[PDB]
Write a protein that binds this ligand. Structure first.
Ligand SMILES: Cc1cc2nc3c(=O)[nH]c(=O)nc-3n(C[C@H](O)[C@H](O)[C@H](O)COP(=O)(O)OP(=O)(O)OC[C@H]3O[C@@H](n4cnc5c(N)ncnc54)[C@H](O)[C@@H]3O)c2cc1C
Ligand SMILES: Cc1cc2nc3c(=O)[nH]c(=O)nc-3n(C[C@H](O)[C@H](O)[C@H](O)COP(=O)(O)OP(=O)(O)OC[C@H]3O[C@@H](n4cnc5c(N)ncnc54)[C@H](O)[C@@H]3O)c2cc1C
Ligand SMILES: COc1cc(C=O)ccc1O
Ligand SMILES: COc1cc(C=O)ccc1O
Lengths: 524, 524
């Protein structure tokens, strides 16, 4: 029977009773079959790391406060999910193995308010991108969401891990406006203009008066968020999505150097541009076995067969244009002129291309217009038992940096028997190298190889000045360990704040490598 | 001889010696004549409130750390300035009367780095908007700053109070990217991607890994900032600034309701739109005595005389358009069509109007193109000894709310013998009512009346759900007191963090109403 670390069988029995006394017997789950549902689907080390001792589903803010107070009484560590679909980063699994999962999304799943004219929503954690899309289409159709690739995630949960989408509102944390948060001893606070009783402005300016705190609750164990506002973009009058195929792996350098000047002013590259390699485009519409059934990495002739059969390049650029048709034509003209300088570049619109090779184009056209999709889950059929772990370091949006990272990561992936499926994404002034490290989750050796590969990728990236933005439970200590300027000054600051707010060391211990005192330096 | 609160003459002597040993004799100032220079120029209520006991000018980060350690040893409270031009909010005056001022800007005044292609600067606190503008014009001329009305302020200091300008980069804190900060016991830390030694990305993404903390150092006493990055916008190929005059004070409702839909998508209102009343337009180019020399409020016929003589409306709208001249013409066309629905509206371009009444138009044309100015200081010649206090609550960008505020504020201003000079500003989805309450700083009665008026304005605004964004030393306790959702949960959070980071209660005690334990509840 899984016990939280540092809690006696007796204290755990007492805590479960107290939790049931608040949320109801139905909403305290301890059966192995119910706990198995919160397993990381894509485990990277031992599959048995990151287990839940229980899952608690509080009805509302008041119940969150009371479960937090009970946790403080009995020293119960509590991890937190909204929808818990953080796949690539641990799913719903706690960093601290044996923690009790607070499932905020199961019961706190209401769209509390949508203002169509001022363009915002006030939301609870259980609202999925599908849920909010459905609500806006029925009740506020001039607005659109900004969604990640998969719509089953939480508008709140994704933003609290600083996740991202691909519309002009792609930076989810940027558009987060106002929070209600239960602090680690059970006090509730509203941020920003929400701290002013009766304010009408909670969702229209992020800051409020005095220190601005909301960011301290993102990639954070300082609070359980119960309500979160987000700004919503107005649907433009029209949109068009285009694909640019580039023949040569060496085109990456010139693509990035043309991309930056066209994105940095948010026009003509109006949405978040993505540059996907042949493998993460081919893997949506085909299986690895379709191209190659030998052992070792995919040979060049397998890559060439994918390009030819599917009509794709080694690098595949996807962008969306918004506005009246005259603006779209004009901006597309500038884009075609700029990227057309690259020999072998080919341009297709979402209304021009409708074949197997256009599947990603049509999906990006949904995503880039705030229409949520689960099409990208087909990537997980590339190989049997496929799982991914996220690797997404930040670099300057400079072709030379792109080429260095492309070569560094692919050569290590080849060495560790993992296919090189990756994209380069430029937000505004920053570049992300998002590598989908696909592995057989059912194979202990493949899980070990993926963990070893990722630790090596993080260290080599950090040595080049490229820090990881978001990581898996298994990598959080290592990634925080790379941000050790001033003899670990950033982590010492985080620890000082964690220990002051959370003296009993209750909320999601080890999230982002930040351990409260009672669990720190204990090797977990 | 001014002593800090809670420090013996002996401990103060010891501290000043240790400070001289670090920064140099010349950079520890205690002469009454040098201290008088750090007096609030626009004191509200008692002029003698908010005195400095000394001013310390550290050469660099290392000296800031050592002066902070000395302060911790001797319990010396230390306030902070960059350029100390926070006029309307206390100037360089400490919230805690008798604090020692850390003058970061005097010697830490270097532009450390400007990247033209990636559009950012890394700066020290002493860099003024004039300094940065001059540097860009000489060494990176494709970039422009975003400046407030007066260029003598600090790019860093203004951002740390969440100040604002009027280009698309008007939200200074939003474009702040990376900080170096000395924490209250003397530890130094870098935020974001700067926490990774050798990172190449400090100024190109704000967040980093783990809880995002930079907002906690704005309107804050949690540390002394020694370096700050800021993103810099590319100069567009062309710009035009326009003035719309509106005849009727009652036009405000329709102006705000037309403004919001044209701004919320950042086009066609591409810059920060400002709507200035006759008095803050007239006060730049004339004196109150020019229009009226009787006692009591300005009569309506005095307002009408200002309008006609200067060719101004009751409400004067200023906006800027950017892009190729065809985009400017097109956007200006949409703006003229929309606001032209208001009878009596008149449109003038920065190339069409060059008379006394076009002074503000030509100044906005500079400011809205990141050309810093001191023209708005002419406002302080309105009446003899003029000073102002800032009142700037946030509201929904809705005409009804604007009208309510206009009337509430003007009515009270009349009662308290102060002219209503104000503007309405829409950032994106929020509105600011920025009232410049002008008063005779040399007149004890006028200072007392201004403080009484502002306390009343804050309470009445708060009762309507309109919170203050930024305030004077004298008002910080009251303003924080209005953000008291959940029995003051926000301030209790800020106090918990202050006491953890600052156990000896050293940095800018009482900033934003946040007092460390040793000074809290002592009425100062
Ligand atoms: C093929 C594939 C594609 C992906 N594409 C993208 C993509 O385009 N963009 C993207 O951003 N991600 C992407 N992901 C990663 C991940 O799937 C999504 O980010 C997903 O939306 C996150 O899970 P969630 O929304 O259910 O959040 P959750 O799992 O509910 O929460 C995420 C984290 O936030 C914190 N948390 C959640 N709720 C609270 C709360 N109430 N209070 C305090 N803390 C809380 C916890 O740390 C938690 O682990 C992708 C993954 C895969 C496998
Ligand atoms: C007529 C008039 C017009 C104005 N127009 C505008 C305007 O358009 N926009 C606007 O924003 N303001 C405006 N102001 C207010 C004010 O003049 C400006 O904001 C000014 O730029 C602020 O002073 P500063 O830049 O010198 O900053 P400082 O006074 O140096 O710093 C401001 C505050 O930041 C903190 N701080 C400073 N340095 C540090 C540091 N190194 N570490 C930690 N904390 C620090 C302190 O709390 C300090 O009080 C106006 C004022 C007047 C009188
Ligand atoms: C697992 O992390 C991510 C995955 C993707 C798509 O593969 C995009 C952004 C991410 O953060
Ligand atoms: C006095 O403070 C301010 C003044 C102005 C312009 O008068 C704009 C924003 C401010 O915060």
């Amino acid at each position: 029977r899984t016990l939280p670390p540092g809690v006696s069988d007796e204290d755990f029995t007492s805590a479960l009773t107290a939790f049931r006394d608040v949320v109801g017997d139905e909403f305290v789950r301890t059966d192995e079959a119910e706990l198995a549902r919160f397993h990381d689907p894509y485990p990277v080390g031992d599959a048995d790391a990151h287990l839940a001792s229980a899952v608690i589903s509080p009805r509302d803010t008041e119940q969150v406060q009371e479960v937090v107070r009970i946790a403080n009484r009995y020293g119960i560590p509590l991890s937190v999910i909204s929808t818990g679909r953080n796949n690539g980063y641990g799913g719903s699994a706690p960093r601290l193995s044996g923690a009790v999962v607070v499932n905020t999304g199961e019961r706190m799943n209401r769209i509390l308010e949508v203002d169509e004219k001022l363009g915002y929503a006030l939301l609870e954690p259980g609202v999925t991108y599908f849920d909010l899309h459905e609500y806006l289409e029925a009740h506020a159709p001039s607005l659109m969401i900004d969604c990640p690739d998969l719509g089953w995630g939480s508008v709140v949960g994704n933003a609290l891990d600083r996740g991202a989408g691909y519309t002009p509102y792609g930076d989810h944390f940027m558009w987060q406006t106002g929070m209600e948060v239960v602090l680690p001893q059970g006090d509730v606070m509203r941020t920003g203009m929400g701290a002013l009783p009766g304010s009408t402005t909670w969702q229209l300016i992020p800051y409020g008066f005095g220190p601005y705190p909301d960011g301290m609750f993102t990639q954070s164990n300082l609070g359980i968020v119960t309500k979160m506002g987000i700004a919503l973009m107005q649907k433009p009058p029209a949109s068009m999505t285009y694909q640019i195929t580039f023949e040569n792996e060496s085109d990456l350098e010139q693509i990035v150097d043309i991309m930056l000047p066209l994105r940095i002013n948010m026009a003509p590259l109006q949405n978040v541009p993505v540059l996907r390699n042949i493998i993460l485009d081919a893997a949506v519409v085909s299986q690895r076995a379709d191209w190659y059934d030998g052992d070792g990495p995919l040979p060049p002739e397998a890559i060439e067969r994918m390009k030819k059969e599917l009509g794709l390049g080694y690098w595949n650029f996807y962008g969306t244009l918004y506005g009246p048709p005259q603006l779209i034509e004009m901006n597309y003209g500038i884009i075609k002129d700029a990227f057309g300088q690259i020999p072998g570049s080919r341009f297709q619109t979402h209304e021009e291309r409708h074949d197997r090779g256009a599947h990603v184009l049509q999906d990006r056209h949904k995503i880039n217009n705030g229409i949520p999709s689960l099409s990208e889950m087909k990537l997980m059929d590339w190989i049997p038992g496929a799982g991914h772990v996220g690797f997404s370091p930040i670099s300057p949006p400079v072709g030379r940096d792109a080429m260095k990272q492309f070569r560094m990561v692919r050569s290590r992936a080849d060495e560790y028997a993992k296919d090189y499926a990756a994209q380069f994404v430029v937000g505004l002034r920053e570049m992300h190298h998002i590598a989908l490290l696909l592995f057989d989750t059912q194979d202990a050796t493949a899980r070990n190889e993926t963990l070893a590969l990722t630790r090596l990728l993080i260290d080599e990236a950090a040595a080049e000045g490229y820090g990881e933005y978001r990581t898996h439970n298994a990598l959080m200590d290592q990634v925080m360990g790379t941000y050790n300027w001033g003899d670990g000054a950033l982590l010492k600051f985080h620890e000082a704040i964690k220990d002051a707010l959370d003296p009993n060391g209750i909320i999601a211990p080890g999230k982002s490598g930040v351990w409260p005192a009672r669990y720190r330096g204990k090797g977990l």
